[PDB]
């Protein structure tokens, strides 16, 4: 079963990227399966709502009283060794905030990391019936 461990926020990076100090470490997290439009992005730079998908991301991680990382069943971290997990702030995970708000796609997920997938699935559904940012 999945659980969720402390961390405390350094810096919130990008729409899906946050750096957190966890187990005494600075470290850079990756947010399990989801894509944001990216503003750091390698061959784009900024899309139409990555400036808004990183300022939800920032707000979010940096009004919070305690940051839970929780990490899935399969490896940690990605080849850019960020560590790949579900964020909570206060209790509320911010890969479904994002999805939901439809600042965020599900991404494609590979096995054994997806066990979250069909609960994200969920809220990108209705974030595309509301017709929110993304799928306005």
Same mark, same amino acid.
């Given at each position: 079963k999945l659980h969720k461990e402390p961390a405390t =926020?350094?810096?919130?990076?990008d729409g899906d990227t946050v750096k957190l100090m966890y187990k005494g470490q600075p470290m850079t997290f990756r947010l399990l399966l989801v894509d944001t439009p990216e503003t750091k992005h390698p061959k784009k730079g900024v899309e139409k709502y990555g400036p808004e998908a990183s300022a939800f991301t920032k707000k979010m991680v940096?009004?919070?009283?305690?940051?839970?990382?929780?990490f899935d069943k399969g490896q940690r971290t990605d080849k850019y060794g960020r560590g790949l997990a579900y964020i909570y702030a206060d209790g509320?995970?911010?890969? $479904?905030?994002?999805?939901?708000?439809? =600042?965020?796609?599900?991404?494609?997920?590979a096995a054994p990391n997806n066990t979250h $997938?069909?609960? =994200?699935?969920?809220? $990108?559904?209705?974030?595309?019936?509301?017709? =929110?940012?993304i799928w306005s």
């Open positions: =926020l350094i810096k919130a990076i940096e009004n919070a009283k305690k940051i839970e990382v929780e509320k995970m911010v890969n $479904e905030a994002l999805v939901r708000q439809g =600042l965020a796609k599900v991404a494609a997920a $997938e069909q609960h =994200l699935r969920k809220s $990108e559904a209705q974030a595309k019936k509301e017709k =929110l940012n």
